[PDB]
Subunit: 40 residues, 3 copies
């Protein structure tokens, strides 16, 4: 049935969530992008 084409599609959405962990590491990198005051 079409249910298979719909099942594999969730595995692609599954790859997006494990990628988000870097957002924790992004804060120390933002230090350089935040080294400046709001609106320069």
């Amino acid at each position: 049935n079409w249910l298979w084409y719909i099942r594999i599609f969730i595995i692609i959405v599954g790859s997006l969530i494990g990628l988000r962990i870097v957002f924790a590491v992004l804060s120390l990198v933002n230090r350089v992008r935040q080294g400046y005051s709001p609106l320069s």
Copy 2:
């Protein structure tokens, strides 16, 4: 029978993951609202 209402429930949970991308701009906004020193 249970499985059908639970199948679409995956697509609703799927919408929440793209929303998180905005958390990157939240850090520069939080700099001012967290600009004060830890109380706890």
Copy 3:
């Protein structure tokens, strides 16, 4: 092994997304690490 063991596997991945909401508190904890300068 069958389609049943493959169905619940998505529900375990569904629990990980609600855990990322908590990262908003990490910014006040990292603020101390944002008053600090990039290593090297």
